[PDB]
Design a protein around this ligand. Structure first.
Ligand SMILES: CCCCCCCCCCCCCCCC(=O)O
Ligand SMILES: CCCCCCCCCCCCCCCC(=O)O
Ligand SMILES: *C(=O)CCCCCCCCCCCCC
Ligand SMILES: *C(=O)CCCCCCCCCCCCC
Lengths: 288, 267, 68, 68, 288, 267
């Protein structure tokens, strides 16, 4: 019928207690960072304080709230040309990842591992390209998820678009952006944001080529592809379209904090590029 | 009362004991002591091998030398122990393995020396490569140095031989060899060996991974990074040197999927 | 099968016979069998930072010498 | 988690077995966790204007001389 | 389950009581406005009155009801031109404020301080500009809130529009006007409609330029900007669009009443301009 | 047990904290902690000003330098703090004032240095003048040096300029600058900074006077005298130097008889 609702994210932080002068063998201020610990001080340990009823909370910096936003992870281009074109009708294929853009990637990479349900939202825009007056009727798009192993479409109209088992979204141009949710689908107990290893052990008794693989890569993160097409048949006036994909990680847990990316990303691994390694600017030691 | 102290410790595992008289307490990474794989988290169904004292004991790696020009050193685990006694044999005879570790870094000097080493244990310590024409190209052989470890550099030097690429890491020290600032490495479990204070670092590491158990031969779970936060100095000598020694004990290691031994291509 | 929860009210309207005061609640009903379809509740927990700020084996007493 | 409140009825239809008379109520259910998302309830309070109209230290008795 | 509901805004005002002739030392009519008080009289204090059951109420002049309206606070212009244009595609940037227009500003300025949740509603209109017959497909707009400190877009298509953390609205042309709510977000306990001060103390030991700042300005009111773009790629026929922003302050409290603005506004402060200082018209003292 | 120690102290007053790791306990002069003036001993009847944290906080005076030729230093209280923040302002705006103090003298060196400073707090530290033709002639300006303090000398040198007399103190070190033997200064509240043992002296001083409250601008209640009981030495150097720093916090200060500010002739 109706369900009605231990430190929570929106609880007020601790009050400041009043504290007075001190003269003793207690030494909060002195410490030793060699131990690997941070000194847990509060202001009353080193100055006189008044009483303050604290009302601020950390509600907006919970993991869930830090990540509660859709971020663009790709832009997919498709078109619907005249049937008289020498060029094939363009359908798009995108290998699913959060590493083609940088903002969400940097936020997730504050952590080594994560678990979340994924919400995907799709914004679709279209335009004419030839300075012509010809027209086009409202387009329908098919967004098909092709998981690893399923046949990837080779033509905008081949049999794979039947989608008997792959999930597909048929989106109608001009309606609210499409949206679906996906569960935590990892083949591990958490997604790995970093994998310090290889997918193959090179064996002595085998050629180097046969035992080779990329550093830091594994099917831990192969999630397959999105394949997108304009379903409408060819039209005399060409229309080009873009599908922007937004990812929001919801119901999220994360583990093992990391220093954030400080120089520009350079591919899907942690590699860096010459000429981008100077994030800090000039400032003199005794200048405010 | 009896004189027990933070600074004076004894560690005993298997047939091996470590003593120290200038410790700065010791760290248990993320507050989690190593443990065997619980039944509720288990995954391979075959009865595991658990070598216990045969492999859970202190192994000392080759000693390195700290000088005024040292930029830093790195090792990966289990890789640095791959050739260590029965731990190494159990690792290569089985498809799967998991293990925690006690890491003890040793570096003594004198009351007239100075310098400070940051000793960091990093889960999934992925390092940057040497190439600006291909990414993720460091080879298995160069990514896995075994007990000799590798080193950090103060300068990125791209490999320009595209005919026969070196395929190795080029780990820049102030970028923690991975594109993030070294000043923030302290969010990883760590200690500092600051010579006026202490002569060792002790880190107890739980097995950490996104799986209960995995391929030790394919994947390193932890990296150990040692960098000079403050450079070595002594009296008014221009070229002081002091050794740094690593001793590491596997803890709660267990293995599954026994078969013939893995014979890896390491050169 | 409604879930009723309370809101943490920030700006309060001039009202205590309808808005600002007498605990304002909100209602959630899940429409889907898959929990991945659910909205986020945001009713989240906090924890002590000690596993990162004080990962030392012997307890830190801040008024005492760290090294002893 | 519905809030039921009464309306102040102005024009009443010819009805007292459904509209005009037997107190007409209305219903509100909040759909969002953030109270900033809520509609305004308009159930507001009034106050005495004295802090602006009579801010004098010694009480004003209107039948008496203001200056005495 | 069901909740069911001390002077309220909709209560009837006080009844008039019947009062008769009087002859006494009670002197309600005489008073002294030097005290700073207003004489609290009602008609029965100075004339004979009948009994009247009062039904009128002040329900529509409660603070909430006086402000319960969306008011236009800005008009933002954007466009989507041909790709062959010498001119850049126009995206808009607006520093959030209620001071670019005058009507809501004057109402809020009956008070010195306020607290409210803000409802923003967005009305979007578009048109062709070149007398051409070419066409355009339905546009999608991105309205991105860029809070102070976040990177402001420099091009309609640069990386900032990824919005991984800024909130953005993707609005589809021709649908219901977009709408969001925001909490009371002030860095103070109330918004200041007037700040009699500076953001910098000029120091003797420092150059005048270094200690200078504008009178009456402070980040009390810096709320960042809205950045708006047409998401669709360039089209051969140029379309221009306008986004009208409407602000309704809801759940509002206000403090310290002020005389309303009586001469034309002149910038974001209280300054006035020569030639606008004569609000009153001519009327002879003894003419009705 | 926890390692608390005589030698390691933290002092916090107002917004200021002092730490020390080589203390030799600390002294509370005559066993009396500072206190506000009790009603049963009160005398001016006006409501006093009590600045509390605005003035009861650590103020550091200009540092001096100890060498093999140093004969000693002296300061007077409240005079040495007359120009210190809100303590100084409250002192000059009021006819009357009283205050106690925490005095912390700082002087570190090394395990190879040696030397010992006697740090004495003297109630009514009247000092001898430079004249053999007039007594009690030291001028207000020369008697009150403010934070720079003054110095002791090993030799009495009479001022012979009777045309324009210098009118200053000539405080001879072994006579404690006042005609009594320095070896007996230990009956005053004191500590010794002996470099092999400790690097600081801490003296908590109650307000002491023959009145409950008095003119701070006319009268100093306490003198601080620092003299080398054993001279500075180091390795085999002929001219070693080490700094001495004074930091003083007023305690329980209260003031009466508020008016316009006193603007004294100090030069
Ligand atoms: C019709 C739409 C179907 C959408 C299909 C979503 C498929 C699963 C995608 C998994 C996203 C994984 C994000 C984390 C990746 C990582 O491990 O680094
Ligand atoms: C996607 C839309 C986001 C909308 C973001 C709203 C940002 C906060 C605006 C605060 C409005 C303040 C009005 C009172 C200003 C004042 O202090 O004078
Ligand atoms: C609990 O769920 C029982 C109370 C039902 C309240 C009304 C439900 C509103 C409509 C939900 C429709 C079903 C959604 C798939
Ligand atoms: C109180 O809320 C319980 C009574 C529920 C009545 C039906 C609710 C109608 C649908 C609300 C859906 C949830 C809104 C996010």
């Amino acid at each position: 019928g109706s369900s009605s609702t231990a430190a929570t994210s929106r609880d007020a932080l601790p009050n400041t207690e009043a504290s007075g002068p001190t003269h003793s063998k207690e030494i909060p201020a002195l410490t030793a960072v060699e131990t690997g610990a941070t000194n847990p001080l509060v202001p009353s340990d080193t100055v006189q304080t008044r009483h303050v009823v604290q009302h601020r909370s950390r509600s907006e910096s919970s993991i869930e709230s830090f990540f509660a936003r859709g971020a663009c992870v790709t832009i997919m281009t498709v078109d619907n040309p005249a049937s008289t074109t020498n060029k094939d009708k363009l359908f798009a294929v995108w290998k699913i990842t959060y590493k083609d853009t940088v903002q969400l990637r940097r936020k997730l990479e504050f952590f080594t591992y994560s678990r979340f349900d994924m919400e995907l939202t799709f914004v679709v825009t279209a335009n004419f390209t030839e300075t012509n007056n010809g027209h086009a009727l409202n387009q329908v798009y098919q967004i098909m998820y092709v998981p690893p192993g399923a046949p990837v479409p080779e033509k905008w109209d081949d049999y794979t678009w039947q989608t008997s088992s792959n999930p597909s979204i048929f989106y109608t141009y001009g309606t609210a952006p499409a949206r679906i949710s996906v569960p935590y689908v990892g083949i591990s107990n958490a997604y790995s944001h970093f994998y310090d290893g290889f997918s193959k052990v090179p064996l002595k008794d085998q050629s180097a080529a046969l035992g080779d693989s990329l550093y830091g890569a594994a099917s831990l993160n192969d999630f397959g592809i999105l394949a997108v097409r304009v379903v409408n048949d060819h039209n005399p006036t060409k229309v080009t379209s873009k599908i922007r994909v937004y990812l929001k990680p919801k119901h999220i847990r994360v583990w093992c904090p990391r220093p954030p990316r400080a120089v520009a990303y350079y591919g899907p691994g942690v590699d860096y590029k010459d000429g981008t390694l100077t994030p800090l600017s000039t400032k003199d030691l005794t200048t405010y | 009362a009896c004189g027990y102290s933070d600074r004076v410790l004894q560690l005993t595992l298997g047939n091996s004991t470590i003593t120290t008289q200038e410790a700065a307490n010791s760290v248990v990474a993320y507050g989690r002591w190593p443990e065997y794989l619980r039944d509720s988290e288990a995954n391979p169904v075959d009865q595991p091998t658990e070598p216990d004292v045969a492999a859970c004991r202190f192994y000392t790696l080759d000693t390195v030398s700290w000088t005024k020009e040292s930029r830093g050193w790195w090792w990966k685990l289990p890789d640095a122990l791959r050739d260590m006694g029965l731990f190494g044999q159990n690792m290569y005879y089985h498809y799967l393995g998991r293990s925690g570790y006690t890491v003890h870094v040793q570096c003594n000097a004198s009351k007239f020396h100075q310098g400070a080493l940051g000793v960091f244990a990093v889960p999934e310590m992925c390092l940057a490569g040497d190439s600006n024409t291909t990414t993720m190209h460091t080879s298995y052989q160069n990514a896995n140095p075994g007990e000799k470890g590798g080193t950090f550099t103060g300068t990125f030097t791209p490999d320009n031989n595209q005919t026969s690429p070196a395929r190795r890491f080029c780990p820049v020290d102030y970028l923690l060899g991975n594109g993030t600032l070294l000043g923030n490495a302290f969010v990883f479990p760590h200690q500092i060996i600051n010579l006026r204070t202490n002569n060792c670092a002790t880190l107890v590491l739980p097995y950490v991974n996104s799986l209960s158990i995995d391929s030790m031969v394919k994947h390193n779970n932890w990296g150990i990074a040692i960098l000079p936060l403050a450079p070595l100095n002594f009296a008014s000598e221009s070229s002081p040197e002091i050794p740094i020694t690593l001793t590491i004990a596997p803890m709660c290691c267990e293995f599954n999927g026994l078969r013939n031994i893995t014979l890896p291509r390491l050169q | 099968g409604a879930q009723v929860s309370s809101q943490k009210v920030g700006a309060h309207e001039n009202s205590n016979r309808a808005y600002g005061g007498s605990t304002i609640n909100y209602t959630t009903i899940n429409y889907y069998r898959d929990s991945a379809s659910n909205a986020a509740s945001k009713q989240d927990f906090s924890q002590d930072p000690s596993k990162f700020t004080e990962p030392i084996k012997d307890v830190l007493i801040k008024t005492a010498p760290m090294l002893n």
